[PDB]
Structure formats: C-alpha cells, structure tokens
Amino acid sequence: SPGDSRRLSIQRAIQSLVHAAQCRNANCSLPSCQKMKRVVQHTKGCKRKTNGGCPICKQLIALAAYHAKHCQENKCPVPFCLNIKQKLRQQQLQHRLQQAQMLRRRMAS
Ligand SMILES: [Zn+2]
Ligand SMILES: [Zn+2]
Numbered sequence: 454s455p456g457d458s459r460r461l462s463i464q465r466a467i468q469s470l471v472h473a474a475q476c477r478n479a480n481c482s483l484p485s486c487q488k489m490k491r492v493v494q495h496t497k498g499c500k501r502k503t504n505g506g507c508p509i510c511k512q513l514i515a516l517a518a519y520h521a522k523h524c525q526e527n528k529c530p531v532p533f534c535l536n537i538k539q540k541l542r543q544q545q546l547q548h549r550l551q552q553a554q555m556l557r558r559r560m561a562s
C-alpha cells in the first residue's frame with residue numbers, strides 16, 4: 454500500500470539520521486551513513502537554517518519532527534530535535550495559560 458510504504462520509508466530515514474548524528478567512524482559502512490552524515494555536518498555549519506530558507510535544513514527539521522515526537526534522549530544530537538521538544542513544551546505552557554484564562558474570565562470584572 455502507499456500508506457505502509459511512506460511510513461516504512463520515514464522510519465528507515467529517522468533510524469539513519471539517529472545513526473549518522475552520532476557516528477564517528479569514517480570507517481562506517483552503512484549505505485545511508487555518508488549522505489546523512491553530510492546533511493548533519495551541513496547543519497552544524499549553517500547559520501541561517503530555516504529562517505533563511507536553507508533547503509537542506511528545511512527538509513531535516515521536517516524529518517526531526519517525525520523523530521522528536523518519540524525521542525526520549527536528553528542530550529539528543531539530531532539537529533533540531535531539542536528545538537522541536539522546546540516548541541512542544543512551549544505549546545503546553547501556553548495551553549495551561551489558556552486553561553487559567555478560562556477560569557479567570559469566569560470570575561472577571
Ligand atoms: Zn555511520
Ligand atoms: Zn542549512
């Protein structure tokens with residue numbers, strides 16, 4: 454199916470990013486490693502990242518989002534993973550504040 458196929462592909466890709474983000478063997482021989490490593494090296498070096506429309510970083514922040522939802526790794530070296538977790542904490546802070554606001558409106562004036 455086209456559904457199972459996309460999912461497979463995304464999960465193979467995230468698995469390869471997780472590998473390549475921490476791989477320190479120039480002697481590594483996983484076929485995907487070399488290309489993913491480069492994309493990861495590039496992000497370390499790219500200052501503008503997505504705010505500046507860099508097309509590589511724009512693609513791996515979308516990949517990291519698929520990854521970060523599940524990631525439990527505290528010092529995760531996948532590019533943008535920490536950012537996506539920050540963004541999620543902040544959505545929750547804001548949600549709590551919406552809940553406070555609801556109670557406050559009820560008592561207001
Ligand atoms: Zn490797
Ligand atoms: Zn970039």
Ligand SMILES: [Zn+2]
Nearest residue numbers: 524529531534
């Ligand atoms: Zn992560």
